[PDB]
Design a protein around this ligand. Structure first.
Ligand SMILES: [Mg+2]
Ligand SMILES: [Mg+2]
Ligand SMILES: [Mg+2]
Ligand SMILES: [Mg+2]
Ligand SMILES: [Mg+2]
Ligand SMILES: [Mg+2]
Ligand SMILES: [Mg+2]
Ligand SMILES: [Mg+2]
Ligand SMILES: [Mg+2]
Ligand SMILES: [Mg+2]
Ligand SMILES: [Mg+2]
Ligand SMILES: [Mg+2]
Ligand SMILES: [Mg+2]
Ligand SMILES: [Mg+2]
Lengths: 57, 260, 188
RNA sequence: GAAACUGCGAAUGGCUCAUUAAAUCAGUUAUCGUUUAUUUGAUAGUUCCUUUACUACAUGGAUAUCUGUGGUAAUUCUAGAG
RNA sequence: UUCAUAAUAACUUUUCGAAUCGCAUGGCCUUGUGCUGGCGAUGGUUCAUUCAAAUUUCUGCCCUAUCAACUUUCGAUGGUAGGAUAGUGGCCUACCAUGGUUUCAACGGGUAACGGGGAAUAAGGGUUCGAUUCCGGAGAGGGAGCCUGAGAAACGGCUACCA
């Protein structure tokens, strides 16, 4: 499903629609207020460090 | 219900507005201020029904916004300020100053007062008390509190007030044989002398008050306002001068005086 | 919730007055504070006319006061020693108005060491005349002296600690002091 | 000057008569038994804490509207970052 | 009056005592940009007043004895203390006393009863009516509970349960 990625300093942010399920399975069973790695999320993201905060059912 | 009331319905409008039965569901509620709801007079009634300087409420509102109107020195932009008894209303355009004084009937009157005397406002007591910093202070039934009064300004005794500055010019004591104006329902706006003061423990102080014509009458103290000593009242009063004639007497004066 | 209605109470004779109107705010009376002595806490409450009316909660300390001298201090409380309404408030240790209580008494000593400086329980040249001019004024009423040595005087708090927030009270002296001691020996 | 926070107002008016029979309500008092924004009158050299080098000519970081990043089948639903 | 108010003693999860804003640009030179000062706004303290607010005094209701006793275990009546409340109080709690009302109708029931102002009728005395333009009181489908707020037990606020 969709993701809601947002860079602080630059102020540049984007839609990343994800149909592939393995990409989304990293975030499962985490809580709002944690850090995530770039590599396991996808092939386009590598070396990045996300921070899971926020979401919607 | 659920706290204070904001409207005032015209039939409930206190009669001495002489508000018109028709031409409005409501009356102007006299706003909060120095004088009690029914004992006040809101300016809309004053400027429109009485003086007719405005033809409607709109024009009164604007009249207050331009602002020559000055009730007791200060300006007011309030359409329904409680301009009560003694309240010196000065309109600087026209120079038509008015003190607020009761016609013998009871309903308030337009008294087209001098420059000049409309400059002090007579005012009663109320208190005598003291406040913080041990300051002795006096209060006027007719609104204001004045600090540091002469120790022998006692209760139900008048005080002349400088008005523009707001201090004490002078005071009239309350006692036997002193010209006294009246502000109580049936005897409202009569004038007389004072003979007795029935003391009464708890149940209201009474005062037996003979007019010029020497028709005696009684009131309560709270509804009595000492205008001076006999002969010289400190305020200029309207034609009639607190006499209050009989019904036939008024009918006599009207149908005698026919000057076309 | 807990209202103060004259509406309820059946009536003077018995006539179970019917429930005229749903009870109103202006009739209300909130939950009882029954403040303890266990870690100083206070919550305020928005009462009629705004008014922050501080509700004391587990209040430690209060300025309990002499009579003879005319003094009070930052004085620690110990416990609810006797409450003449209900003994329920003694064991639960809930502080309340007119409750007899024990006062740490160290501040009552430390200040007494200046005031007179004669000591209770058992330097500089011009002060010795102020020391001499003062003292032998109040001899103190025995129980208070022994309680001074105990480190535990008998006050009888007179603030309303659910209304006030402050837990400020009054050292017992003389007859009432002599009375509440008999009740403390009766209870114990 | 849109938007928004702050302020104030929305406890007024309006409708109705179910309850309710010493209750309501009318006059009568009282509050030396109380709250009262508003109202118009009043008004706070003492915050310092030893007194030979100290923020005061101005202390702090937030949060909204915004910038986008969005969800939903719906809704005067609003989550994250700057 | 234990009032106003003033003192001695302190406290206190030490309230308040403007790190606020728009128009006006004056007065002395120790010639700095110095020190100074007008007309207003809001705010802010308790005292006042007003709008009010809660209680409360007295007296006053329609029918029914085919309601003569009722209230008091589960506050009834009083007291002492507290608790609460803005505050008075059986308003609540403890301990105590046994009161309280009643044929001068207590209590109970009924009301196709909201109260009053008033209305119709209309010699006098009256009867019946008053949902309804004003004044009170209630209610917002029921019954509860509460947030904010000076003021709400708000419902063109919310929480819930029933319908
Ligand atoms: Mg209403
Ligand atoms: Mg009196
Ligand atoms: Mg006093
Ligand atoms: Mg106040
Ligand atoms: Mg009590
Ligand atoms: Mg009915
Ligand atoms: Mg009726
Ligand atoms: Mg009616
Ligand atoms: Mg009906
Ligand atoms: Mg009505
Ligand atoms: Mg309906
Ligand atoms: Mg409700
Ligand atoms: Mg409504
Ligand atoms: Mg509605």
């Amino acid at each position: 499903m969709k993701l809601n990625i947002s860079y602080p300093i630059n102020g540049t942010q984007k839609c990343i629609e994800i149909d592939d399920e393995h990409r989304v399975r990293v975030f499962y069973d985490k809580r709002i207020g944690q850090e995530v790695d770039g590599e396991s999320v996808g092939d386009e993201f590598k070396g990045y460090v996300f921070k899971i905060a926020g979401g919607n059912d | 219900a659920r706290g204070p009331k904001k409207h005032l319905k015209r039939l409930a409008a206190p009669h001495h507005w002489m508000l018109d039965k028709l031409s409005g569901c409501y009356a102007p509620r006299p706003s909060a201020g120095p004088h009690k709801l029914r004992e006040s007079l809101p300016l809309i009634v004053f400027l429109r029904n009485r003086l007719k300087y405005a033809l409607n409420g709109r024009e009164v509102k604007a009249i207050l916004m331009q602002r020559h109107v000055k009730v007791d020195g200060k300006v007011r932009t309030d359409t329904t300020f409680p301009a009560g008894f003694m309240d010196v209303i000065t309109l600087e355009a026209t120079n038509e100053n008015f003190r607020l004084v009761y016609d013998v009937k009871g309903r308030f009157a337009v008294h087209r007062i001098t420059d000049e005397e409309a400059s002090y406002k007579l005012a009663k007591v109320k208190k005598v008390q003291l406040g913080k910093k041990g300051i002795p202070y006096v209060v006027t039934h007719d609104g204001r509190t004045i600090r540091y009064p002469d120790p022998n300004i006692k209760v139900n005794d008048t005080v002349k007030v400088d008005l523009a500055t707001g201090t004490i010019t002078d005071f009239i004591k309350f006692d036997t044989g002193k010209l006294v104006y009246v502000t109580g329902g049936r005897n409202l706006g009569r004038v007389g002398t004072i003979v007795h003061r029935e003391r009464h423990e708890g149940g209201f102080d009474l005062v037996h008050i003979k007019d010029s014509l020497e028709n005696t009458f009684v009131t309560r103290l709270n509804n009595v306002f000492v205008i001076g000593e006999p002969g010289r009242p400190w305020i200029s009063l309207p034609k009639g001068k607190g006499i209050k004639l009989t019904i036939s007497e008024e009918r006599d004066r009207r149908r005698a005086q026919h000057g076309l | 919730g807990i209202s103060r209605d004259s509406r309820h109470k059946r009536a003077a004779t018995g006539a179970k007055r019917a429930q005229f109107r749903k009870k109103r705010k202006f009739e209300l009376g909130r939950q009882a504070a029954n403040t303890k002595i266990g870690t100083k806490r206070i919550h305020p409450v928005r009462t009629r006319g705004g008014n922050q009316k501080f509700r004391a909660l587990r209040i430690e300390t209060g300025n309990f006061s002499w009579a003879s001298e005319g003094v009070a201090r930052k004085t620690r409380i110990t416990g609810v020693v006797y409450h003449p309404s209900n003994n329920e408030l003694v064991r639960t240790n809930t502080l309340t108005k007119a409750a007899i209580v024990q006062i740490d008494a160290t501040p009552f000593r430390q200040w007494y060491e200046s005031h007179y400086g004669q000591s209770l329980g058992k330097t500089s040249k011009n002060t010795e005349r102020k020391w001499a001019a003062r003292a032998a004024e109040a001899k103190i009423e025995h129980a208070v002296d022994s309680q001074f040595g105990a480190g535990r005087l008998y006050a009888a708090i007179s603030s309303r600690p659910g209304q006030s927030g402050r837990c400020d009270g009054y050292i017992l002296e003389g007859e009432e002091l002599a009375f509440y001691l008999r009740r403390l020996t009766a209870k114990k």
